[PDB]
Design goal:
Layout: E1 4-14, H1 34-47, E2 51-60, E3 64-66, H2 75-82, E4 98-99, H3 101-109, H4 120-133, E5 137-138
Parallel strand pairs: 4-5
Antiparallel strand pairs: 1-2, 2-3
Helix pairs in contact: 3-4
Function: Forms part of the ribosomal stalk which helps the ribosome interact with GTP-bound translation factors.
Protein name: Large ribosomal subunit protein uL11
Subunit structure: Part of the ribosomal stalk of the 50S ribosomal subunit. Interacts with L10 and the large rRNA to form the base of the stalk. L10 forms an elongated spine to which L12 dimers bind in a sequential fashion forming a multimeric L10(L12)X complex.
Length: 147
């Protein structure tokens, strides 16, 4: 029993969005809450930093809005996957921004249902790759070219 009626997919300024986004009028369709939208948004884009994120506000008929993206594509979810969470303090000395093959795959597999790709390598690479550009590094994914 799950069916979305309106899914706003757009890119908003991370750490710079105001209660007057480009959609605004086209967004207030889940209960009329533009502040809560940006309020929480800024909270995240405020704890992480400034950037652009392809919001995917899934508005369900039951006036239900669900979505959680942080930082441009790939990083939208890879970030949290890389280990970005802090919580309220950090242990000390730690290279933040690391993902593992099994993770980029679990992320790609759910990102390549039937679009146009096929082999995981193509998708996986696109994933672990996007992370690579995100300064992130693939903690796993051993280059075993000899065994």
């Amino acid at each position: 029993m799950k069916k979305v009626v309106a899914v706003v997919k757009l890119q908003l300024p991370a750490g710079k969005a105001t209660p007057a986004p480009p959609v605004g009028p086209a967004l207030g369709q889940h209960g009329a809450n533009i502040m809560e939208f940006v309020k929480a948004f800024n909270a995240a884009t405020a704890n992480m930093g400034d950037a652009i994120v392809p919001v995917e506000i899934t508005i369900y008929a039951d006036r239900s809005f669900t979505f959680v993206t942080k930082t441009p594509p790939a990083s939208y979810l890879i970030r949290k996957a890389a280990g970005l969470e802090k919580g309220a303090h950090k242990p000390g000395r730690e290279k933040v921004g690391r993902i593992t093959w099994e993770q980029v795959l679990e992320i790609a597999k759910q990102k390549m249902p039937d679009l146009n790709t096929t082999d995981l390598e193509a998708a996986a690479r696109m994933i672990a790759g996007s992370a690579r550009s995100m300064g992130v590094e693939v903690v796993g994914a051993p280059e075993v070219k000899d065994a």
